Design a protein around this ligand. Sequence first.
Ligand code: FMN
Ligand code: FMN
Ligand code: CB1
Ligand code: CB1
Lengths: 226, 228
Amino acid sequence: TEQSKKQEILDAFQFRHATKEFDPDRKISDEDFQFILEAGRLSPSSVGLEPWQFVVVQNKELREKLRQVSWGAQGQLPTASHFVLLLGRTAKEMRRDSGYVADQLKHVKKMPEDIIENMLKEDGVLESFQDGDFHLYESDRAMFDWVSKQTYIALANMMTAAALIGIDSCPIEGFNYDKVHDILEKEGVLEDGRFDISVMAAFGYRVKEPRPKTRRALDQIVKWVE
Amino acid sequence: MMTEQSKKQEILDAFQFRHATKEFDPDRKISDEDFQFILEAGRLSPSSVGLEPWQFVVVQNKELREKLRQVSWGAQGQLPTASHFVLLLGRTAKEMRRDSGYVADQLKHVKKMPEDIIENMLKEDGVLESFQDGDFHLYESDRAMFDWVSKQTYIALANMMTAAALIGIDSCPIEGFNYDKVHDILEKEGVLEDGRFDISVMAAFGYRVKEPRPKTRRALDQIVKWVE
Ligand SMILES: Cc1cc2nc3c(=O)[nH]c(=O)nc-3n(C[C@H](O)[C@H](O)[C@H](O)COP(=O)(O)O)c2cc1C
Ligand SMILES: Cc1cc2nc3c(=O)[nH]c(=O)nc-3n(C[C@H](O)[C@H](O)[C@H](O)COP(=O)(O)O)c2cc1C
Ligand SMILES: NC(=O)c1cc(N2CC2)c([N+](=O)[O-])cc1[N+](=O)[O-]
Ligand SMILES: NC(=O)c1cc(N2CC2)c([N+](=O)[O-])cc1[N+](=O)[O-]
């Protein structure tokens, strides 16, 4: 039944909540966590450039360094079965003349040469969109925030995938950007400036049943223009 | 054991089913129930501070679709043929501050945040301002604040597409549009509600007409790193 299918999926959306603390002795199995990451990997990205890395931070020392500067993750970092930093490619990786773009489109996407150079010429498709349409050249931040929006697609899907098999999660922005950037830079995670932190994500099994879910009414958030 | 591994396969199949659909079947329409389920996936999406700073605008009007089409080089095929077209709007910067009414009413009446919490949350140099200004540098400009809001709308966009694909419905996320012209069109149309909203990203839904090329993604060991 497609109606029972829809109910099941909506049950997962209700099940998923912002888990603040997980069961410290229950670990997501490796197959299950690979399924979660694959939901991330299969995510769509603007221009198909996949401007992200998923860093699985199981090392306890590093978790604790992050906990110290992440006032939104106080419960999640120590107790998560798996903890993920979602990195975005940095602004220098994303221009028409960046190696990463060129390699991504040629060797991953198998874009034919004639298409590539239409895409990456001066005032090509990529620049016409990045600069003219979306103003991503105004600052490195503007470029990176656009990258980071891509990463939130991967974040939702990983969270939704987990919930659909009954695994809890919590998206996490509650960190000091400067201090986290510095921590990861020093440790080599940002890879000589190819990456920067976008958002974090914890996964595991709930300890308590959550309070009921609250959302604005469909009537408030949906406008139709017939 | 094998049944759970099969449920995971069903899910992955939906993620493989979903693709950037360039053109839809203009006769096959998404049922009203099914599209309301898609929208529910958006509504139920998580958001920073649970502020749900979005509005979903379903643009079925042919005239408006075509006005948008004239300025959206990425949507040439999708806009005329989509069963449903959605503009994801984000709240603007002045809506998102600790003493904005949108924020105050959202947390007080939708989230039902109790009084001592909401006081710590919205007070000066309270939790919200310390996060917005100290941690994420969102006071630096209206765009920084809006792009943060806009990131949240991409959670709702992702869940809408995945939900659609789980029941066999195609989608296409769309950034290929001129912000300025699209902004002005939506202003003149009154869609942005006197500057409370601005355009974030758009999404088309419907039924494919062509089968897609094989999906390509970077290798798992290219996009995943473990720090054990
Ligand atoms: C991008 C993002 C960042 C978030 N940051 C945090 C965080 O740092 N710590 C936390 O406990 N919850 C965080 N949340 C959880 C929200 O408060 C929560 O999703 C919202 O209140 C809705 O409740 P629900 O997720 O249970 O439906 C975040 C949510 C999102 C989408
Ligand atoms: C945020 C976003 C915006 C996009 N913009 C457009 C667009 O304007 N027009 C279009 O045809 N495709 C667009 N795409 C589709 C991407 O090219 C596509 O998702 C990517 O190449 C991966 O291919 P797949 O989704 O077919 O797996 C967009 C995708 C995302 C995530
Ligand atoms: N009109 C286009 O050629 C276009 C534009 C965009 N958006 C970036 C401007 C995207 N895309 O976002 O994936 C993809 C395409 N494309 O068809 O490969
Ligand atoms: N440390 C917190 O109190 C905190 C921080 C954040 N992030 C914004 C800083 C979020 N949240 O993002 O939802 C939620 C909370 N919270 O527990 O209600």
